[PDB]
Amino acid sequence: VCDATCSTIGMAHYLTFDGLKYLFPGECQYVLVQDYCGSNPGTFRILVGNKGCSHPSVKCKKRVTILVEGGEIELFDGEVNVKRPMKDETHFEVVESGRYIILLLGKALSVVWDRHLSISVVLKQTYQEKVCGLCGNFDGIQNNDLTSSNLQVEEDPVDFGNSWKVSSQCADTRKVPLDSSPATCHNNIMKQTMVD
C-alpha cells in the first residue's frame, strides 16, 4: 500500500486520500484531517480556515493550524509561524524549496503548501483507517469518504463539510442550485467558452 495525499485543488475543492473530488465552498474553520476519530487515542489534529472563500476570487486567503505533540504551528501570508513549540523537536523539520513550504512532522506525516492555497497533507501505511475529516479515512474505499462527524454517509457534500466545522455557531454554507455555469459564466456564454 502506497502513501496517500489530500489536496485543496483551488479555492473550494478537496481530493480525499482514497480519491474523491467534491465541491465544498465554506467560510468557517474546518477539520481537514485528524487522528482523534472514534476509539483511537490519537496524535494530531490538522485544521484549515478560509475567509471570504465561498466565491473563489482574489479574496480567499487560507489559514492552516496544525496541532501535534502539544504544538501549535500555523501559517498564513506566505509564512510559517510557530505559536507553541512541541516536545519532540527532533521530528520537526522545515524545507523551504521552490514555490513550496514542505513541512515534516513525524515518520508518517507531512504537509506541502504553495504559500497561497494548496494544502497537500501526506500520510503513510501507519494510519490506515485511523483518520477522519474532510479528507476521509484512508481505507481504500472511496464510497465511504463522506461519513460525517455523526457517523453516517451523506449524499450531498455541502452537508458533509458543515459536520466538520470547528465552531458550531458560525454559518452553514448554503445548498447552491446545481448549475454548470457557476457565477459569471452564467449569462455570458462567450466567457464560458473562453474559459474552457
Partner 1 sequence: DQRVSMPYASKGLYLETEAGYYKLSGEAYGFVARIDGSGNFQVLLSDRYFNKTCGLCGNFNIFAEDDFMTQEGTLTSDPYDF
Partner 2 sequence: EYARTCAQEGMVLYGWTDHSACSPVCPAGMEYRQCVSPCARTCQSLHINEMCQERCVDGCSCPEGQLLDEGLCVESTECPCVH
Nearer residue to partner 2 within complex by CB, 85 or 182: 85
Instruction: At 120, list the grid cell.
Output: 497537500
Residue 137 binds: one of Ca ion, partner 2, partner 1, none (C-beta under 5 to 8 A by kind): Ca ion
Q: Does 164 bind partner 2 (CB under 8 A)?
A: yes
- Considering only 149, 158, 185, 192, the residue that binds partner 2 (CB under 8 A) is 149
Nearer residue to Ca ion within complex by CB, 74 or 145: 145
Nearer residue to partner 2 within complex by CB, 18 or 154: 154
Question: 3-class secondary structure for the chain?
Answer: CCCEECECCCCCCEECCCCCEECCCCCCEEEEEECCCCCCCCCEEEEEEEECCCCCCCCCEEEEEEEECCCEEEEECCEEEEEECCCCCCCCEEEEECCEEEEEEECCEEEEECCCCCECCEECCCCCCCCECCCCCCCCCCCCCCECCCCCECCCHHHHHHHHECCCCCCCCCCCCCCCCCCCCCCCHHHHHHHC
Quote the least distance from Cβ 70 to Ca ion, whole Å: 29
- Considering only 124, 129, 154, 185, the residue that binds partner 2 (CB under 8 A) is 154
Contact stretch for Ca ion (CB under 5 A) within 3-11, 39-47, 145-153, 178-186: 145-153
Nearer residue to Ca ion within complex by CB, 19 or 78: 19
Q: Does 69 bind partner 2 (CB under 8 A)?
A: no
Q: Does 160 bind Ca ion (CB under 5 A)?
A: no
**Positions that interact with partner 2 (CB under 8 A):** 31, 45, 65, 67, 149-150, 152, 154, 163-169
**Positions that interact with Ca ion (CB under 5 A):** 18, 136-137, 139, 141, 144-145
